[PDB]
């Protein structure tokens, strides 16, 4: 039980803090949405009633 027995937990906390503080100052640039189309058709075989 000494200050050396906390290095891993301290590194975990520091990693989380640096991730948060890097995300805070990151510039946001909204990307234009493209590639929207109706191309999700469904195949299959017809029933073709007999008579």
């Amino acid at each position: 039980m000494a200050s050396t027995t906390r290095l891993v937990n301290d590194r975990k906390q520091l990693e989380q803090q640096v991730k948060d503080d890097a995300r805070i100052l990151a510039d946001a640039r909204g990307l234009n949405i493209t590639t929207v189309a109706n191309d999700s058709a469904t195949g299959g075989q017809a029933i073709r009633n007999v008579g």
């Binding site: 995300r23 990151a26 946001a28 640039r29 909204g30 990307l31 949405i33």
Partner: peptide, 14 residues
């Protein structure tokens, strides 16, 4: 591959 801020800004622009 994008952050939350980018998505929020895109939705706000729309």
């Amino acid at each position: 591959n994008h952050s939350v801020d980018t998505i929020v800004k895109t939705v706000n622009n729309i």
